[PDB]
């Protein structure tokens, strides 16, 4: 049966990407939190 | 508003009289058309000291 995850890299980058996060204040706060926690990879 | 005229008005008076006028009449009609100006002490002194004769000269 069809499952929930149907991967598409263009959609992945446009929804969860670095520039998408930079575009809004809440996304910049997300990036700040992840930098403070010390994640090795900030975004997808 | 208290104003002094610079010309003649049919019911108000004429030529330098100080009369009490509703704020709208002065603000929207008289001042922006030059028929009168507000009766500040400086305005009254300036009108009376020099330009009284100058205004009285212009009949029409």
């Amino acid at each position: 049966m069809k499952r929930t995850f149907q991967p598409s890299e263009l959609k992945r980058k446009r929804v969860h990407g670095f520039r998408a996060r930079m575009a809004t204040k809440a996304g910049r706060q997300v990036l700040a939190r992840r930098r403070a926690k010390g994640r090795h990879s900030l975004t997808v | 508003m208290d104003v002094i005229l610079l010309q003649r008005i049919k019911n108000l008076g004429k030529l330098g009289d100080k009369v009490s006028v509703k704020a709208g009449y002065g603000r929207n009609f008289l001042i922006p058309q030059g028929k009168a100006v507000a009766a500040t002490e400086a305005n009254t002194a300036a009108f009376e000291a020099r330009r009284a004769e100058l205004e009285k000269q212009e009949a029409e």
């Binding site: - | 508003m1 704020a23 603000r27 001042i31 922006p32 507000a38 500040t40």
Partner: protein
Amino acid sequence: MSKVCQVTGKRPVVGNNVSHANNKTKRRFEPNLHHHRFWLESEKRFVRLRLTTKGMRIIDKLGIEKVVADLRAQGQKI
């Protein structure tokens, strides 16, 4: 770009509605703002300002030129 009076600086403030049973809910009080065109002789033109009726009372008492000079000195495009 806001409900702010150009002449006096008034703006909305917050308060409460109080009922007969003393229930309190948040509200705001707004200024009596609106637009008005003033003839300016020194520049031969009409200047349009967003202001309150208290702003008009101040303009009536002080003169339009003095008020415009004060706003320009405060740094507004009039």
